[PDB]
Amino acid sequence: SGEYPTVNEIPVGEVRLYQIADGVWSHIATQSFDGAVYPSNGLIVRDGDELLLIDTAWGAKNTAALLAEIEKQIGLPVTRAVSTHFHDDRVGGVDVLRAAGVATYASPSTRRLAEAEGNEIPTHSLEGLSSSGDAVRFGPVELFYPGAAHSTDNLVVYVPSANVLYGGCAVHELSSTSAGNVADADLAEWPTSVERIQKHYPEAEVVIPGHGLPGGLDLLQHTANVVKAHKN
Ligand SMILES: C[C@H](OC(=O)c1ccc(CN)cc1)c1cccc2c(-c3ccc(CS(C)(=O)=O)c(Cl)c3)c(C(=O)O)[nH]c12
Ligand SMILES: [Zn+2]
Ligand SMILES: [Zn+2]
């Protein structure tokens, strides 16, 4: 159909790519957790004759499959990866990346939390992101720390060439009916963090959530709405 691929269409272990814009893809994979199956997204951004990866494919074997799919579909080497928070859907697979020549990065907050939780740990620390509203450049993207939301360390990623906003797990898809896995969330700060994203990226054309279908800037307001209803 060429439509964005949904949880039931992706067996656990296989990875899909979806072209978002020129030089921008999402990657989609599925994983089992606590007896249910979930999709999750990441991003790929062309960086000259190399690629920048945002987030793993949620597990070691999924991430190996991601690398194979990139080779098949794109054929440029992944040289760097950024993980946007410490959960396994973002860092699970960092060891696979590190053994495939990829330099792995995350904020110091993410690295601390990953280490404390027993999740895989990116090698390199991203300074300059410790206060909400902070932004830094990283190859063809901007990394932005909006404040605590889904997690206290969550980062969002903007692709200025294409006006693509990758919200990661701080942003939910339009069909969502709850705020996802909130165990490490700050439901009270989340709307404020989303407002910071809205103010900083008003020209975003595509908004990609951490899980589920991309859309437009409405994903941000919807996220605030579902989080408020969850807190309530
Ligand atoms: C890998 C990730 O682990 C955690 O978070 C986690 C938190 C604490 C512990 C305890 N040490 C362990 C693991 C995770 C595991 C399993 C599921 C998720 C979901 C998710 C996403 C969407 C929906 C549909 S929705 C919006 O309509 O609710 C749902 Cl149900 C869940 C999300 C997310 O929200 O980012 N992260 C998910
Ligand atoms: Zn998470
Ligand atoms: Zn998530």
The string of DSSP codes covering 6-21 is PGGGS-TT-EEEEEEE
**Ligand nearest to the backbone CA of 154:** 2
The angstrom resolution of this structure is 1.2
* Distance spanning both ends of the chain, measured CA to CA: 38
Q: What is the DSSP letter of 184?
A: T
The CATH classification number of 7-231 equals 3.60.15.10
Strand partners, 144: 135, 156
Method: X-ray
Q: Encoding tokens for residue 204?
A: 């975003």
Q: How far apart are CA 49 and CA 77, in angstroms?
A: 8
Which helix (DSSP H) or strand (DSSP E) does residue 108 occupy?
helix 108-117
C-beta of residue 176 within 8 angstroms of C-beta of residue 93: no
Domain boundaries, the chain: 7-231
* Cβ atoms 29, 44 nearer than 8 A: no
- Is residue 144 within 8 A of residue 158, CB to CB? The reply is yes
Active site residues: 85, 87, 89, 150, 181
How are beta strands 78-82 and 103-106 bridged, if at all?
Answer: parallel
Which is it for strands 135-138 and 156-159: parallel, antiparallel or unpaired? unpaired
Q: Which atom of ligand 1 is nearest to the CA of 169?
A: 35
Contact criterion met (CB below 8 Å) for 180 and 170: no
Contact 14, 29 (CB under 8 A): yes
- Decide if 114 contacts 184 (C-beta within 8 A): no
Exposed e or buried b per residue across 18-33, where buried means at least 16 C-beta atoms within 10 angstroms of its C-beta: bebeebbbbbbbbbee
Give the CB-side neighbour count of residue 55, counting CA atoms within 13 A: 31
Tell the residue nearest (CA) to atom 9 of ligand 1: 183
Element (H, E) at 142: strand 141-144
Report the distance separating Cα 60 and Cα 45, nearest Å: 21
Q: State the closest ligand 1 atom to the C-alpha of 89, by its place in the atom list counted from 1.
A: 1
How far apart (Å, rounded) are the C-alpha atoms in residues 50 and 47?
5
Task: Determine the distance separating the centroid of ligand 1 and the alpha carbon of 63, expressed in angstroms.
Answer: 18
Both structure tokens of 69: 């799919």
